[PDB]
Amino acid sequence: PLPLHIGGRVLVESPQPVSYTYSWPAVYFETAFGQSLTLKFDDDQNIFRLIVKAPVVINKPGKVDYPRVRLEKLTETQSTSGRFLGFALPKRKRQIEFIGDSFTVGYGNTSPSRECTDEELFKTTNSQMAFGPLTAKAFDADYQINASSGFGIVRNYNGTSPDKSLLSLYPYTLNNPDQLYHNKHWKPQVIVIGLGTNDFSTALNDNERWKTREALHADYVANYVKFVKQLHSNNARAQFILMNSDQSNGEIAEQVGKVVAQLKGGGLHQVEQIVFKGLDYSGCHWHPSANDDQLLANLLITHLQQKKGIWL
Amino acid sequence: KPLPLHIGGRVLVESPANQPVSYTYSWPAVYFETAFKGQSLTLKFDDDQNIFRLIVDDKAPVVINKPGKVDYPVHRVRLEKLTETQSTSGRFLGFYTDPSAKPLALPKRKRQIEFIGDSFTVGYGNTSPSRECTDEELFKTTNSQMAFGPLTAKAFDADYQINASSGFGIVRNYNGTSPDKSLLSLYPYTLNNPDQLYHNKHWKPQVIVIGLGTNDFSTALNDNERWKTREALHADYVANYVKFVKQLHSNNARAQFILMNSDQSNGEIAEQVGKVVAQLKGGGLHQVEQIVFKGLDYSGCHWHPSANDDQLLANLLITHLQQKKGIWL
């Protein structure tokens, strides 16, 4: 079993081969060295891409021996997990984290149709073609993509999972509250957060806890401000980009404007807003296409390239 | 013999027959520069409204206090207006020498920065040791060249314009005063009057710093004001601020904007500016950011930023601008 470098949140267990368990999107594993290799899998949940040359697809291998190398998770798993059991490594000083919802995940980004069954949706979701991994790869930065489709700051798509939010999900290694994530070597100089579409895309239902739109605004702003504050207090070198669409009549963007003002008013000044525009939304269910993802990546790339000493 | 000169700030240049070229000004922090080989210099003034400082080479500044209509007897030479004139103007009539002197290269500054604002941007009472100031003490202690704007420009060797006037807001001025006016309505003009629109094809600042909103929001609405609810004031402030920045951008495509405000008035000011930045970006004008400043002592006249506060705000701006690759294009 070769020494490994890991990107993304994984639970490491050492009973037998060391096992790596992951459920957040866009996880990867890299190795370096001979003239043979075998990847050991226990994953009937994900589609993967192996990069030795052009990428090769590995679809739901299950528990099998598969005979520089980069394995990248492509698909989204909100309710299940997958296991990888193993094979001079990359020493990337730059680190960037993307936090978000469907957009950040790459939900349906490679679908040529906006009409997708559940199966089509799973298969055409490619997190590695989403803006986050593209942006990271432009700077040769290690990346974590901590995102989950449908989730908001305080409110989720159409008031679904009212007991949850991206923020309640965020502290955990997997899609369950069994293990909290800590890695003292994970200290991204840049954090890009894209949340609010799900909080505001739909009207409040009568059985939700916000009884007026203003109450929702107030709760969203308060919690987003607190969130960036905790991230900062644990990582003094982080600089924040709060990224949102120009949709929902500007409601999302305005609440984020308030978040940014309030954070700066409180003394946390290393925070900026990006409002993105002009997407075709031609992926599944009117989500960003692969084209849209490249566009968004180009936006972030140009933005970060103008910031002196952003990585130091 | 008048020397070739360089002008900073908005100036009405007139060339009346059989008289010196006349430079008329009213906006704060105006300056005139010249350079020559020789040993004599006279400044011709027609200004009993301003205090100036004169900077000869590497020497300390010398104060010139309301010189009036006089010839002032005194290389690189920089003359700076210090004081604010809201209801009057002053004239400078040039740098005069002996005909044997050689004109030298004037400053060719590629960098240009503009500060738009209110009393904070002017430097209202900034050098006063006391927060109690009569009108005369307020006038004397106001030094625009020590406010954060000129200090920021000098760290980058940029030319600057300080288009600020005390008490004014985006839509609403201090305690609803001058309800027929705002900073925005004064802004188009070369001087303190509607008589001439300012146009300067060579003035295209890469950076524009706007600090406005303290006067819109620092006080409660009176009964006789046109906004009947606080929400009305917010809405009108946001729309006009957005409108203003768009207009500035439409005439100067290169300009990058910094909207700068205090953490005071319970955060009301910062919040409205957050909405402005968001609405600008949402409309496709992305080259805009917010700065919220904190931790001033406000020891100048009537609880305004001190000269110390001014240096602190300058350092804030300098550091911000230093981190921006290619901001000077």
Residue numbers in the entry:
A (entry chain A): 27 to 41, 44 to 61, 63 to 81, 84 to 98, 108 to 127, 137 to 361
B (entry chain B): 26 to 99, 107 to 361
What did the original publication write about this model?
CE2 enzymes are acetyl esterases (that are generally not appended to other catalytic modules), which are reported to be active on synthetic aryl-esters and acetylated xylan. Here we report the biochemical properties and crystal structure of several CE2 members, both single-module CE2 enzymes and CtCE2, a component of CtCel5C-CE2. All three 3D structures reveal a bi-domain enzyme in which an N-terminal β-sheet “jelly roll” domain (around 130 residues) is linked to a C-terminal domain of approximately 220 residues. The C-terminal domains possess an atypical α/β-hydrolase (SGNH-hydrolase) fold, consisting of repeating β-α-β motifs that form a curved central five-stranded parallel β-sheet, in the strand order β2, β1, β3, β4, and β5 with strand β2 interrupted by loop insertion.
